[PDB]
Coordinates of C-alpha atoms and ligand atoms in Angstrom, one line a residue:
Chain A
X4 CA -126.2 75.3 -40.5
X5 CA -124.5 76.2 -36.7
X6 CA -120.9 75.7 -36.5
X7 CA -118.6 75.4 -33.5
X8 CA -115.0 77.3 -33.8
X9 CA -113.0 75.1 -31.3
X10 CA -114.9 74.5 -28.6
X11 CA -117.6 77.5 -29.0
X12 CA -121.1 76.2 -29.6
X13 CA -124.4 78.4 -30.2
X14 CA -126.8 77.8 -27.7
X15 CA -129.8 78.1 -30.0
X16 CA -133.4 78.0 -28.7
X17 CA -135.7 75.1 -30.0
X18 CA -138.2 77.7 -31.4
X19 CA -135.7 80.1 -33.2
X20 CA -135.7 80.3 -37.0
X21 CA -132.2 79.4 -38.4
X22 CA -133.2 79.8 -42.8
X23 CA -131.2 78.1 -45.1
X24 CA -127.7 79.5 -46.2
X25 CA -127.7 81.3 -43.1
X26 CA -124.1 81.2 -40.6
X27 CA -124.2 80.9 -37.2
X28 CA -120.8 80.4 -35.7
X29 CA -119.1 79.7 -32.2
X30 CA -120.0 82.1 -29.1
X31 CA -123.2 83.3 -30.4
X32 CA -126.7 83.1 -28.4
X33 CA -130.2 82.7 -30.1
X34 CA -133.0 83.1 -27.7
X35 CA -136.6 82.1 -28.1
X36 CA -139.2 82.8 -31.1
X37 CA -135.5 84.4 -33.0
X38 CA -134.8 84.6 -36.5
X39 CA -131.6 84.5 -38.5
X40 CA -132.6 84.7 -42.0
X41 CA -131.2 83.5 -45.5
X42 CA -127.4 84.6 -46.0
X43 CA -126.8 86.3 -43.0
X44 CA -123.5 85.4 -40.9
X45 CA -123.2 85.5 -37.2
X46 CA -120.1 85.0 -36.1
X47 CA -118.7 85.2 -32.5
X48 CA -114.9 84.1 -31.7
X49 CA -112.9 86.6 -29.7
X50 CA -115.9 88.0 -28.4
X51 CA -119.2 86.7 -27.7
X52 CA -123.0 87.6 -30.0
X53 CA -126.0 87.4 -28.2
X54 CA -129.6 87.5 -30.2
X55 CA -132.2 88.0 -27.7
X56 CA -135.7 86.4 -27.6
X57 CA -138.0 87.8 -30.4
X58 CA -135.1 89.4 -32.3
X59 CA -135.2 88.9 -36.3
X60 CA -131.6 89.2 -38.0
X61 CA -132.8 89.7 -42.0
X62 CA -131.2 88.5 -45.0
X63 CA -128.0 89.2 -45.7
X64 CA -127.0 90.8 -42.2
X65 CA -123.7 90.4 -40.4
X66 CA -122.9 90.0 -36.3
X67 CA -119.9 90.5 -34.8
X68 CA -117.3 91.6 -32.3
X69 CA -114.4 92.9 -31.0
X70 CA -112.6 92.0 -27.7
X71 CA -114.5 93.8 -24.9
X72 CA -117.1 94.8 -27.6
X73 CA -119.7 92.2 -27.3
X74 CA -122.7 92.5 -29.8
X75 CA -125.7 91.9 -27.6
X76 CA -129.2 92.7 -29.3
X77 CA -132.0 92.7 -26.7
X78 CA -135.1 91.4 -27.5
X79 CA -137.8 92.3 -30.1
X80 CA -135.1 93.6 -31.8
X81 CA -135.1 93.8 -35.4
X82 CA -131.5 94.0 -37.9
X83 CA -132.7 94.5 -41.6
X84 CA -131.5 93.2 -44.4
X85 CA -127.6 93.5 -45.0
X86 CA -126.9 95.4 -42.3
X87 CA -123.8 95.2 -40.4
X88 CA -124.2 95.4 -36.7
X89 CA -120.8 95.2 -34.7
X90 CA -120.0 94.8 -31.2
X91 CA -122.8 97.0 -29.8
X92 CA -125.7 96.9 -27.8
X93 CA -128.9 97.2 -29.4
X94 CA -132.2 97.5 -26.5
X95 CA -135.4 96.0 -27.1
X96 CA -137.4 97.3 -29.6
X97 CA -134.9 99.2 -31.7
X98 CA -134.5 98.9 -34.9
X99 CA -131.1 98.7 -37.3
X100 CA -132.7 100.2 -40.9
X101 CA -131.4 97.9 -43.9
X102 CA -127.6 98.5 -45.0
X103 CA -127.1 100.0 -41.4
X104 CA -123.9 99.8 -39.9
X105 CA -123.7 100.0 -36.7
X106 CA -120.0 100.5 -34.9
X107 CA -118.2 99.4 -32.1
X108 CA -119.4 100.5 -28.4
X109 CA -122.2 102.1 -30.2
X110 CA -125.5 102.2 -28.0
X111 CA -129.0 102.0 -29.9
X112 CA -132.0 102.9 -27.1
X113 CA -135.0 101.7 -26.7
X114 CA -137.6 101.4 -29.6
X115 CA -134.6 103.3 -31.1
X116 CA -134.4 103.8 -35.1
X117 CA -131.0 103.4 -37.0
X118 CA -132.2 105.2 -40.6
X119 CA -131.8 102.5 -43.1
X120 CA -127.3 103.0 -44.8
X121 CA -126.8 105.1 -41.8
X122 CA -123.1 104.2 -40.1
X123 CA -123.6 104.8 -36.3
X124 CA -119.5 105.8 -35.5
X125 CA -118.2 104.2 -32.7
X126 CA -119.4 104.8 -29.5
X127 CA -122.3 107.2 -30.4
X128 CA -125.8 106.9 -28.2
X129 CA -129.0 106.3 -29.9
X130 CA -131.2 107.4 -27.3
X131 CA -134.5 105.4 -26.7
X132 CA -137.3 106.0 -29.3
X133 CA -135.4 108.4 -31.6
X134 CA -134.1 108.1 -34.9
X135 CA -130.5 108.6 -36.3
X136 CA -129.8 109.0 -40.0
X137 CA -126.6 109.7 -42.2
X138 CA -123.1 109.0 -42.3
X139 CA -122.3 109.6 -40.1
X140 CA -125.3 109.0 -38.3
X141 CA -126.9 111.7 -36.3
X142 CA -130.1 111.6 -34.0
X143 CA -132.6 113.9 -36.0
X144 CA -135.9 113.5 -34.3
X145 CA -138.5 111.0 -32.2
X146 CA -139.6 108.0 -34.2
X147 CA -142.7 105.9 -33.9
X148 CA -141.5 102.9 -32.2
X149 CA -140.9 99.9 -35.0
X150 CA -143.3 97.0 -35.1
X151 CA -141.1 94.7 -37.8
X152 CA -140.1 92.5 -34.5
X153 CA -144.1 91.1 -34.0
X154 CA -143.8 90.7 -37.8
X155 CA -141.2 88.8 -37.9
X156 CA -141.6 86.4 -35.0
X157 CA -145.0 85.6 -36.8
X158 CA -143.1 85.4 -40.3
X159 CA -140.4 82.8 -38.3
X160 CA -143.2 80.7 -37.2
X161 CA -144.8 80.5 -40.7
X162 CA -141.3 79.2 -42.0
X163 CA -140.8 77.0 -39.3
X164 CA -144.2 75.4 -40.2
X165 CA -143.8 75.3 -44.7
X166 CA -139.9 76.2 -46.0
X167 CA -139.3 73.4 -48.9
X168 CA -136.6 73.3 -50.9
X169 CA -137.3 72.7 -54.6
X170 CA -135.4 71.9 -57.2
X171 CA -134.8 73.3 -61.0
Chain B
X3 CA -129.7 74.4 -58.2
X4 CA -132.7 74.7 -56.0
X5 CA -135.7 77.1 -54.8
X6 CA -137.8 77.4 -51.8
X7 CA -141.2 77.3 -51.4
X8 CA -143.1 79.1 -48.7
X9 CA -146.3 77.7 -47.8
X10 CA -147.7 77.5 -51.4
X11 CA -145.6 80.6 -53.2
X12 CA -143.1 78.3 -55.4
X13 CA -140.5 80.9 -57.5
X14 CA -141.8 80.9 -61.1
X15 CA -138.4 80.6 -62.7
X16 CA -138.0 80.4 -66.6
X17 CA -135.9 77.8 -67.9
X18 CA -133.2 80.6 -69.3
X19 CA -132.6 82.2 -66.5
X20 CA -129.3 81.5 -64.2
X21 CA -129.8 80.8 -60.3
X22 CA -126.3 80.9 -59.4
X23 CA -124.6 79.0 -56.3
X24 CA -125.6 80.2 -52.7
X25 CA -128.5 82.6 -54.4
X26 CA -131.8 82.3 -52.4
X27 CA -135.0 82.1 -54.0
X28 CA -137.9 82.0 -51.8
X29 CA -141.4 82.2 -52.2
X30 CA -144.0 84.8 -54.6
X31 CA -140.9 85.3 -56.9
X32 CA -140.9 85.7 -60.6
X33 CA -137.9 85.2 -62.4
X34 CA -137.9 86.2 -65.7
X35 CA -136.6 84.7 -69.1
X36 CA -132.3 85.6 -69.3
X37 CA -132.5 87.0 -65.8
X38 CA -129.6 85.9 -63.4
X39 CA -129.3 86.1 -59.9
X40 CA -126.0 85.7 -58.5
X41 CA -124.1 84.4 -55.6
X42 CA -125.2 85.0 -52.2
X43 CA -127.7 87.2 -53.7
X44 CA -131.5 87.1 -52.0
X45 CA -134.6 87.2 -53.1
X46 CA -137.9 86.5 -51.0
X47 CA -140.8 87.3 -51.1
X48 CA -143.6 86.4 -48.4
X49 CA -145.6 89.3 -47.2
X50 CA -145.9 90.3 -50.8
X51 CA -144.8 89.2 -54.1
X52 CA -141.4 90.3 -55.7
X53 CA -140.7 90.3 -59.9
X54 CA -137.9 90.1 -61.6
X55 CA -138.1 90.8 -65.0
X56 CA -136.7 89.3 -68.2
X57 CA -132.8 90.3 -68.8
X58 CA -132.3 91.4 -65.3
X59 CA -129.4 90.7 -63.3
X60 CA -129.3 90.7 -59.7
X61 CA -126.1 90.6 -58.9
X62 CA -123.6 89.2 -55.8
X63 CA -125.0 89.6 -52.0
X64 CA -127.9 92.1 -53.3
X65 CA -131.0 91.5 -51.4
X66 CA -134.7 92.0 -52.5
X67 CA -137.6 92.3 -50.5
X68 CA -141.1 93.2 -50.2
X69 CA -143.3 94.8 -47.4
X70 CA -147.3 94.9 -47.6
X71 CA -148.6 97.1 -49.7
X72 CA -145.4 97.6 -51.8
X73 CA -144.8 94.3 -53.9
X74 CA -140.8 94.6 -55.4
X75 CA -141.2 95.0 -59.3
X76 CA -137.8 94.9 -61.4
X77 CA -138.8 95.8 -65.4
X78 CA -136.8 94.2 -68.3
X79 CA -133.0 94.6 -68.7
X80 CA -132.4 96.0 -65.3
X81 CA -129.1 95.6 -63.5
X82 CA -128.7 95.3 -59.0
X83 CA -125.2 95.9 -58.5
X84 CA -123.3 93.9 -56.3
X85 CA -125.0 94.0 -52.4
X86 CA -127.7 96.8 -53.3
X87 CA -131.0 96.0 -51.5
X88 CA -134.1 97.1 -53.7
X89 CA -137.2 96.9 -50.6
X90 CA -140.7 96.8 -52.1
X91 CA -140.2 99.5 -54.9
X92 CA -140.1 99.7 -58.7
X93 CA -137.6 99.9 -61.2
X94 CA -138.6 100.5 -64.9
X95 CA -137.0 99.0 -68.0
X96 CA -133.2 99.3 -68.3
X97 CA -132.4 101.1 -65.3
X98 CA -129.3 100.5 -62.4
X99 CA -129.2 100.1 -59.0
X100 CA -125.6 100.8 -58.3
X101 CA -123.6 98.6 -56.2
X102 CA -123.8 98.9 -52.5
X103 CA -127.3 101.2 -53.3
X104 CA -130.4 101.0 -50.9
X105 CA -133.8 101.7 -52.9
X106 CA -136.9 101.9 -49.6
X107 CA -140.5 101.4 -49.8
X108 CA -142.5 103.0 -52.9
X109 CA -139.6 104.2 -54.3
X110 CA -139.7 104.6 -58.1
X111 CA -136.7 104.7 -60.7
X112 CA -137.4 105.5 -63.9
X113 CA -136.5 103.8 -67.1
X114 CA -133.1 104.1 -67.9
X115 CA -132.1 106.0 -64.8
X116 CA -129.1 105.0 -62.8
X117 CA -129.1 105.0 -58.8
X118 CA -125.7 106.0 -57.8
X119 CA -123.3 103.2 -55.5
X120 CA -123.9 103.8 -52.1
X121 CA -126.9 105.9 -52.5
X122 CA -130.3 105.4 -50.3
X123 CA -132.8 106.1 -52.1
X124 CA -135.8 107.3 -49.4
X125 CA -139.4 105.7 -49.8
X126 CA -141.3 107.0 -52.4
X127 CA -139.0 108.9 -54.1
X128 CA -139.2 109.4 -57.8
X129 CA -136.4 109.4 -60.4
X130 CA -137.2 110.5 -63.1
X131 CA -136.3 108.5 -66.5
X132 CA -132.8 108.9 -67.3
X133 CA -131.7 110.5 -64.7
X134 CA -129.0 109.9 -62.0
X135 CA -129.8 110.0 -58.0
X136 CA -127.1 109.6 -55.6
X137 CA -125.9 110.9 -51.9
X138 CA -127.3 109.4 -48.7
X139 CA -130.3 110.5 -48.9
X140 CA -130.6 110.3 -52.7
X141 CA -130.9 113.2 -55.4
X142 CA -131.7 113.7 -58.6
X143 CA -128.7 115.1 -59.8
X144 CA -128.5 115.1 -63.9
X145 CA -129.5 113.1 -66.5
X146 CA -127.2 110.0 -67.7
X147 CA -126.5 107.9 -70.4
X148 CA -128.6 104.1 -70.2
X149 CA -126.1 101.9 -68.8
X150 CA -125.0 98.7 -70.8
X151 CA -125.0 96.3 -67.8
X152 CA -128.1 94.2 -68.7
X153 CA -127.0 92.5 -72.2
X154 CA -123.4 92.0 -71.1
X155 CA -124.7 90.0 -68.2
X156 CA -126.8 88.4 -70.3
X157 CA -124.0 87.1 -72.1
X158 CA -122.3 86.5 -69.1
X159 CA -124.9 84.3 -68.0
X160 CA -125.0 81.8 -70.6
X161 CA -121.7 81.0 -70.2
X162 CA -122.6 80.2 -66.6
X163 CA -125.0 77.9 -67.2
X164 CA -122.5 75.9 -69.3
X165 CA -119.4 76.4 -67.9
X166 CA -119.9 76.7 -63.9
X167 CA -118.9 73.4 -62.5
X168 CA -117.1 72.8 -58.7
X169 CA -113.7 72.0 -57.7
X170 CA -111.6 71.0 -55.1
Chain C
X5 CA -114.3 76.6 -54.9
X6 CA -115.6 77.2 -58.7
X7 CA -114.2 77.2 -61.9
X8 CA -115.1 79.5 -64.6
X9 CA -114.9 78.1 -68.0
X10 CA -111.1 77.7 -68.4
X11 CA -110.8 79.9 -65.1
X12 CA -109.5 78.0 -62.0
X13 CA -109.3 79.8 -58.8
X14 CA -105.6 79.0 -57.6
X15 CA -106.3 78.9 -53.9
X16 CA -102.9 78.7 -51.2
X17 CA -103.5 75.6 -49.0
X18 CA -103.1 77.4 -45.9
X19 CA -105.8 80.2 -47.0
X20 CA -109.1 79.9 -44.8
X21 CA -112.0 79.2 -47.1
X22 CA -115.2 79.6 -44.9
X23 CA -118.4 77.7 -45.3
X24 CA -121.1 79.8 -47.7
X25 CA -117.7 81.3 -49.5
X26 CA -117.4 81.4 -53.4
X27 CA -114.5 81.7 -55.0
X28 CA -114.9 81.5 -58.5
X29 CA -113.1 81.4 -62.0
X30 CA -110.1 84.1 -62.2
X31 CA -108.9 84.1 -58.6
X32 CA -105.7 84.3 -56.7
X33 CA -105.3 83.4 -53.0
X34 CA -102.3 83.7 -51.4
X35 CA -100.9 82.1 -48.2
X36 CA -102.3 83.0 -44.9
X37 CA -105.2 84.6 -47.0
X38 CA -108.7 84.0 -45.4
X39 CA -112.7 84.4 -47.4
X40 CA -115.0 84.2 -44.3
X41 CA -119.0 83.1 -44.5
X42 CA -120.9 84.6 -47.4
X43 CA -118.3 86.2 -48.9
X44 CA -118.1 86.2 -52.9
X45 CA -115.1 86.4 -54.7
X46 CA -116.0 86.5 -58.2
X47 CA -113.3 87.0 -61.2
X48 CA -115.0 86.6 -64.9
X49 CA -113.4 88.8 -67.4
X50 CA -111.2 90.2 -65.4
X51 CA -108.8 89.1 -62.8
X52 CA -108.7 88.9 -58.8
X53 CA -106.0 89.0 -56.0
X54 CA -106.0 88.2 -53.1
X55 CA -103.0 89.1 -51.7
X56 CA -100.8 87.2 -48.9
X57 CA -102.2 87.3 -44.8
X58 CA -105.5 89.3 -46.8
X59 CA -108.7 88.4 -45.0
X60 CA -112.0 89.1 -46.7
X61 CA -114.6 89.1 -44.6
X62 CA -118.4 88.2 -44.1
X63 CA -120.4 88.9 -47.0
X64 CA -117.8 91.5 -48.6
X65 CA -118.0 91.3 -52.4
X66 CA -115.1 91.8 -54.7
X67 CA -115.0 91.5 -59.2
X68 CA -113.3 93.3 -61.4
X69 CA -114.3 94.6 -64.8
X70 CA -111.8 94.4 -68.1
X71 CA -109.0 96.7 -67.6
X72 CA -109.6 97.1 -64.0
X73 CA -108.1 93.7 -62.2
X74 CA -109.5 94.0 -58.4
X75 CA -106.2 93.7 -56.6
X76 CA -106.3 93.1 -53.1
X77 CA -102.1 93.6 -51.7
X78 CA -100.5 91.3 -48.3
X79 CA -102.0 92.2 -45.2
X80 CA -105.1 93.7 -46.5
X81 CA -108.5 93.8 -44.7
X82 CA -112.0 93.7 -46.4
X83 CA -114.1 95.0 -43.4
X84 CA -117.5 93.1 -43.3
X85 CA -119.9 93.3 -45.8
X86 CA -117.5 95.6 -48.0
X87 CA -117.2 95.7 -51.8
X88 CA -114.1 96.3 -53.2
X89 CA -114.6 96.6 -57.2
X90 CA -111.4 96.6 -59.9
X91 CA -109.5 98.9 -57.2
X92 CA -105.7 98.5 -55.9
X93 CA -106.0 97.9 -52.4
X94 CA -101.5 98.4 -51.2
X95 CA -100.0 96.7 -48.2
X96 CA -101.8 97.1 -45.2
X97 CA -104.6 98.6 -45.7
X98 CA -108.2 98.4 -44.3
X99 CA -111.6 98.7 -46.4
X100 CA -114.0 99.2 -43.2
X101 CA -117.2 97.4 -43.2
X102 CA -119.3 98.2 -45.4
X103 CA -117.5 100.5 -47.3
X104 CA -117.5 100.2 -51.1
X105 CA -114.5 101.0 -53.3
X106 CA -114.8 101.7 -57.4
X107 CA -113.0 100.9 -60.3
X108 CA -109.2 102.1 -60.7
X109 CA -109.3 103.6 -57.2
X110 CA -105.9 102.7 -55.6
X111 CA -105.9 102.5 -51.2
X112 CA -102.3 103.4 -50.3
X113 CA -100.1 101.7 -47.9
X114 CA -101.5 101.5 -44.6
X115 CA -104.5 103.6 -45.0
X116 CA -108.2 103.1 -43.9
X117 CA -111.2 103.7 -45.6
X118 CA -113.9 104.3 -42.9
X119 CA -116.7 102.3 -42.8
X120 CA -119.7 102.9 -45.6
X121 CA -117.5 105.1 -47.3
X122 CA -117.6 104.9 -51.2
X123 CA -114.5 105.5 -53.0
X124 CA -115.8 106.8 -56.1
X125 CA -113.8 105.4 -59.8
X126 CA -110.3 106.6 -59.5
X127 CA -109.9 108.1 -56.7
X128 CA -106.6 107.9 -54.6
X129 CA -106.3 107.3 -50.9
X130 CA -103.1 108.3 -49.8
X131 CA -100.8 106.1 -47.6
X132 CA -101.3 106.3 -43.8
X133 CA -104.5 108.1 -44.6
X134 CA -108.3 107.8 -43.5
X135 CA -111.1 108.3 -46.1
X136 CA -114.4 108.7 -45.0
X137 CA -117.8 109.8 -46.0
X138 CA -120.3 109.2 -49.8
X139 CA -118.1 109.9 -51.8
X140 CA -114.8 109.7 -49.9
X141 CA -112.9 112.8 -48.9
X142 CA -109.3 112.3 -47.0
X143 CA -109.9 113.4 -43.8
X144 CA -105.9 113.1 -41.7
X145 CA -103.5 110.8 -41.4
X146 CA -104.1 107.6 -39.4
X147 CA -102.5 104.8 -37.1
X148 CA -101.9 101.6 -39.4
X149 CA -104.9 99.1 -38.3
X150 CA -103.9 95.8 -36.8
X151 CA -106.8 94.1 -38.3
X152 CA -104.8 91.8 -40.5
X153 CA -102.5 90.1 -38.0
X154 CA -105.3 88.8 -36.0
X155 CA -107.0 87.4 -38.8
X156 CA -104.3 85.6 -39.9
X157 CA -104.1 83.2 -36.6
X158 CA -107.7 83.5 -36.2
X159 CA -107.7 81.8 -39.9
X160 CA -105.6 79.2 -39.5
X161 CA -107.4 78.8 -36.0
X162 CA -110.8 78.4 -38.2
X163 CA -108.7 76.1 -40.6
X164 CA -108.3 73.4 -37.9
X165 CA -111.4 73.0 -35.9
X166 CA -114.5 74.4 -37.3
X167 CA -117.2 71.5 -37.6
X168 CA -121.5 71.9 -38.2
X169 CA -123.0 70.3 -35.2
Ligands
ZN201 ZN1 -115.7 92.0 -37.2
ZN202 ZN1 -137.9 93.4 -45.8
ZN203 ZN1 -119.0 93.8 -60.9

């Protein structure tokens, strides 16, 4: 479930989605209509996590950070499955493509597309509604904007409302 | 070991197959006979249905997934390496999805054929049968021997299921 | 913790053992080590180490396949998410998030494999050296990381007050 490292406590909103066999773990933040789905870890300790309102952290994803690194995703933001997003700052909108990894300091605009095994180096800009591919990543061209946020924040609800365990 | 049910999409699970510790499950899922799915490994399906298929092992932390319009369809004797995230594409009979691997939206790998660890394989790309595909993105680069991965974890499985117990 | 037929993991009792961690059959874990959330530590018919002050991290995979044991040396890091398969990971080394590392490749002393890298079966990473790229390619000598020391008191940190609300 959420777990407090010494005194650190997520603050998680009454209407976020927290799945089963999912982490959440000291100085982390989970804002309104959120999602952290089965398996994934989100882990602050020496440096704070925020999840922002609307923003859906898929299966198997990891958050973390590094002293004066602190991983803050805006909202409507969307991390896809098994991606590894790390002390950077991810606007609202943007999107971190599944089996991302996303660096320290690294900056991912607006409505912003990280190409799904891309590994954004350290410090590189994303600028706002553009997407970066490779590794290492590299910004290639403009990109739709991402609707897998308004997908998700429905898809939360919907689990919120009929997720049973069964037995076998 | 249990399962989750989304609204009214309960995982069909035969009774051969091995849902290992800390696997996930959930919702329009069809597990095979002999398939295994291994720890920390997920597997969901919600906005469309997911299969896996008799003798196929998806193995540690490997994620699958399924976006309208493209349901997730694993054939017979076909091996997900450790971590690999297969997203609403098809894999024929006897083929690999190396370890680490990312496999997008319509994708296709043909029987026998072997996706490379590491690789992303880009939505709707074909491999051919036989045939290996790796880089980031993915190519077809030379055709390969069918890997042997599906019977020994078979095997494997088995003794799971009769010889996993917990400790202290 | 989980044993494997006759395979018990044999676990140090000041290792770190997070929540959602599975450690099973075939496993060594030596003191100061530390498995954080999700990670999976799987030895079947073949062998792990975890060496001494190692820490694998959150959701990093490791096995090992007959006639390659996956062993992990002292002061080791598993970045995040990494996969570290039958390889020889020496003394101080860091396997950066992400990055996955094949059977009978050997990580030399000190040296870093960048993150999403893939060492492909075999292949040797000097010591002091940075690998980076799929596949890997040494790329220049690099500073020794200073991953491992903080993740040993962060462990034991972990080990004493870490509680579900
Ligand atoms: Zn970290
Ligand atoms: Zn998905
Ligand atoms: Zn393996």
């Amino acid at each position: 479930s959420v777990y407090r490292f010494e005194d650190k406590t997520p603050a998680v909103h009454p209407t976020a989605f927290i799945a089963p066999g999912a982490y959440v773990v000291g100085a982390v933040e989970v804002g309104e209509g959120a999602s952290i789905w089965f398996g994934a870890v989100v882990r602050g300790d020496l440096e704070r996590v925020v999840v922002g309102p609307g923003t859906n952290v898929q299966d198997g994803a990891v958050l973390h950070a590094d002293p004066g690194f602190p991983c803050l995703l805006g909202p409507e933001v969307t991390v896809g499955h098994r991606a590894v997003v790390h002390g950077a700052v991810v606007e609202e909108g943007a999107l971190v493509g599944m089996g991302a990894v996303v660096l320290n300091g690294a900056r991912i605009g607006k409505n912003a597309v990280v190409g799904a095994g891309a590994v954004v180096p350290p410090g590189m800009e994303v600028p706002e509604g553009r997407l970066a591919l490779g590794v290492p990543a590299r910004v290639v061209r403009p990109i739709d904007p991402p609707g897998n946020a308004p997908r998700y924040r429905a898809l939360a609800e919907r689990y919120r409302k009929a997720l049973f365990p069964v037995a076998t």
